[PDB]
Amino acid sequence: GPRRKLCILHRNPGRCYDKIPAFYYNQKKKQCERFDWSGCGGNSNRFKTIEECRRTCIG
Amino acid sequence: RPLPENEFQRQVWLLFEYPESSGPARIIAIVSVMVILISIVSFCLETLPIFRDENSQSTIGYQQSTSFTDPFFIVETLCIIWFSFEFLVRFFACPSKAGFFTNIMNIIDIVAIIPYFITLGTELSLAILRVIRLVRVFRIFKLSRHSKGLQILGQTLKASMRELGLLIFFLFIGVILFSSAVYFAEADERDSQFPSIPDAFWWAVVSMTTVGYGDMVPTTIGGKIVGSLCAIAGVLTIALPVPVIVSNFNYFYHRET
Amino acid sequence: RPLPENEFQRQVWLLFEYPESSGPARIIAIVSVMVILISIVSFCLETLPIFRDENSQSTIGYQQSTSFTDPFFIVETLCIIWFSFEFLVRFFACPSKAGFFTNIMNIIDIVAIIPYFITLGTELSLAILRVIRLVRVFRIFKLSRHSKGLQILGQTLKASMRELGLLIFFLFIGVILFSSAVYFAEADERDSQFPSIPDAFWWAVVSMTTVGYGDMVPTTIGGKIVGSLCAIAGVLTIALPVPVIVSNFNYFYHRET
Amino acid sequence: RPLPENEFQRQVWLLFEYPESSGPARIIAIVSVMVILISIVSFCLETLPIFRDENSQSTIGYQQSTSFTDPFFIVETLCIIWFSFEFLVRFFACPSKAGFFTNIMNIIDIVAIIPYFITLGTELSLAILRVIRLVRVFRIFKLSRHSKGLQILGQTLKASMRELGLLIFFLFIGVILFSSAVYFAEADERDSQFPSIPDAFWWAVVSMTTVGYGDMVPTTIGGKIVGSLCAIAGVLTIALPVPVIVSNFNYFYHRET
Amino acid sequence: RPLPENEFQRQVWLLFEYPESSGPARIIAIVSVMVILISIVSFCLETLPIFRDENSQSTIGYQQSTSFTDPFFIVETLCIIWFSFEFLVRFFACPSKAGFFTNIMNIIDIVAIIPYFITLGTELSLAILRVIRLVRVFRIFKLSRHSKGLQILGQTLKASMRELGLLIFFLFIGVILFSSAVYFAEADERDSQFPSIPDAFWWAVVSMTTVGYGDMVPTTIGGKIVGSLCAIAGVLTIALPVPVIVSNFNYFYHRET
Ligand SMILES: [K+]
Ligand SMILES: [K+]
């Protein structure tokens, strides 16, 4: 599926040391997956709640 | 460049036509430049959600009322009344009124003046209003009067019409070629990002120009080869007319000095 | 080239060869341009899901039937009939039929004509059909007869074959080098987007051309360094032969005037 | 540029101004270069999370105290002490102290020296400290003294001020035009990527420069047409004055030899 | 270059040095070109997951054993045998043995030949093995013996060393400047994609080169302004030394004829 580049992106935990429970859309799995965000850096393929990730990566 | 010869029309034309002639002419030119800049800033800020949601105010951006409570409407009215005053002065002080409407620098003024009065008249179809609000941005071209670089660019565009047409034609041919190639090379895929050739037109135009938004990307090996060829051919195609256009611009630029 | 001298073949050749010779010749030229444009538009619109889903009609883009209810097949039949009539007239009025097939402008017509008749004969393997429908787009090259810019571009490509080959060779060398570098620099990673060097070929061609889709992006520090070097080397290797190709194009472009 | 003639100021001026004069002058030049790059590396590394989290140290990047436990503070204070020593030597050995503060190469030294002492006086408003720590990066321009190509680049920028301003003006006009077009073409969409024209400025600036970040991308057909037009107009506008600036740079580059 | 004069060393040297001299020399050149291409294809295909997973086999890409069951090892052994035979014959037939190891082509041959023998000796630290595998891609530079365009590019790179260094220096300065600017402009956000200046180096190199991957994008308004400045300044910085390098390439390119 060709959504925003926000969706065609790989998970980037960041450069800090934390385990923030974020949700990112994996295109390889064609679905949203939970991951640990370090709290800094990362990319636009990061969401707080799975509802918004499913909203603006699937429709 | 003859004067009006009315002994008062000539003075007004000198004041409103040659900024370097006198101090008041320079003041008028600076005031006009600031008015155009203020109009552009107001037009850009009209779309901000802060004012758009917390407001009629969405169809045209401002509310036309006798009270005139909206600051954006007040600013637009002031800019439009200044534009109309300047245009009327130029039309009433132009030595050749018959040839006044031939200069594109005056057609710019008419185009920048009309939409406000069109909305005012219709206040006392929805896409038409959006088109009017879109053409309301053409007052940014009113800076060509006070900018020599903009006039040089306009002359370059007028002189390089054939090269621009050739660039458009070449880009269209390449876009058709590579859109067809990428649609047919990535057609037998459920996850293919190219629903059709007209949809692949977007990918072609962004790949030939090296913009590459990444929204549409080939997936199969044939699609990857087609995309690489598209990028290379787009670089070449854009690089072909650009030196001619640049030579035209350079000739028109160093001519003034 | 001389007229056929048959007193009837010469008239048809002048009618179908020199648009500026007479008014009917200009009419025929405009008709041919419009027919080519209509064919391109129909070919591009045959792929829209509005018609493709509401349908044979997907593998070939049209349904061959005596009733001919499908508008796309009707348009394609009319375009192919016009192309065949024009080709037959030009081949029967060509003074030198021996040298008729050497010209690339007639090879273009033959290539644009064949796919329709090949599918018609097949009606009376699936990748073959896809390849045929892909080469069906070459009727856009039929505009080269009515446009001088496309002829200039063709002559430029013919003259700049060595520079084009040099550009392709340099691109291939850089692609191999940077694909190997980015694969080995980002190999010990679970989330690596470069499973192999042939997979990194796409990243290399995208980076060197500076399209930058972002689908494959380096993550390790060595990967970032390799990517920056790849961008720089791709810019340089594109900019090396493009000025020569541009000079060839400009020489062929100003030669007409 | 004559010697000071004081019989002692001349020796110091020659030592600290002309590296080729003697071996000690060359070693002083190398020491200054190494100190400048050491300061650059320390400034860049102070921002890494490894040292930032395991640390005030976040607002300024160092801890000012008599103990001087922080290695980054030690490196920064050594670099600043070397910069101050060099600046004091150059100011006390300059034959024309009145004209000393006119050269840009000394303004650069003063700018690279001030922020450390400003912070020291403050520790002896939060955004002010952040902007001061930002302008702390201007010691990268101290390499212009030891680098000829940087001086040629500076002279080129000084000579091409009008062309740079013209490029900025043209980019601004195109950005406003295409931001307005892309906002109004894609405004009636429930989930639109352009909240307003000022936000569409980002898409315009990344499309004209052909960077194409992909965060903002048009969706509707009108938006895609506007995007292609924006790409073409941006590449043309960028290519307009780049050859002039390049000619200026080449003239200044071949002027030395 | 003088002939060997031994009446048998001269014949072998002519056979293995000048392809146009005789038919056997031409077929030897063709065989060498095909062997180099086969070696490159095998090196690239060794990394495919189909063979890598279904198999030393991943550290080096081939299994070194007496049986030699792995096809990749067989192909690599044959290519290395041909390279060794060619190099040994050239070294034994070179008229000037003292000056033989000064030509860049023989150094390229030795670099392309070492890693296989190093791995064979080791079979008789893991990053060392990865570096040895990575430097096995330098046999793509063995094509410079049979390609004149590659030799022209090499001479251009040798002649344009100062311009390449100036481009690298300017890019580094701009990268440091814009990385600091975008880190400090986009620091007071949790959604900030720039954790530090060394990480912002990636964004700077991507934006200055007009690649625009989109993995790192500014969010704050100051970040957007810094990104605009980064794009424009990167375009200018790349465009400054490129015309000089292109002029050098054209001079070395048309010097052949
Ligand atoms: K992109
Ligand atoms: K790009």
Author numbering:
A (entry chain A): 1 to 59
B (entry chain D), C (entry chain E), D (entry chain C), E (entry chain B): 138 to 192, 206 to 274, 289 to 421
Paper passage:
Among the most-studied ion channel proteins is the Kv1 family of tetrameric, six-transmembrane-segment, voltage-gated potassium (Kv) channels. As observed in other Kv1 and Kv2 structures, the voltage-sensing domains (VSDs) contain the membrane-spanning S1–S4 helixes while the S5, S6, pore helix and selectivity filter P-loop form the ion-conduction pore in a domain-swapped configuration. The selectivity filter of potassium channels consists of an array of four copies of the extended loop (the P-loop) formed by a highly conserved sequence, in this case TTVGYGD.
Dendrotoxins are peptide neurotoxins from mamba snakes that bind with nanomolar affinities and block potassium channels. By adding an excess of α-DTx to detergent-solubilized Kv1.2 protein we obtained a dataset of about 300,000 particles where an additional cap of density can be seen outside the pore. From our cryo-EM data we obtained a C1 map of α-DTx bound to Kv1.2s at 3.2 Å; this was done by extensive image processing and was helped by the larger size of α-DTx (59 residues as compared to 35 for ShK). The positively-charged toxin is tethered to the negatively-charged outer mouth of the pore by three salt bridges: toxin residues K30, R15 and R3 bind to three channel residues D355, D363 and D363 (D6’, D14’ and D14’ in the turret and pore helix). In the selectivity filter of the toxin-bound channel a continuous density is seen to extend downward from the toxin to the boundary of IS1. This density is well modeled by the side chain of Lys5, with the terminal amine coordinated by the carbonyls of Y377 (Y28’). In the selectivity filter a large density peak, presumably a K+ ion, is seen in a somewhat offset IS1 binding site; a second, larger K+ ion peak is seen in IS3.
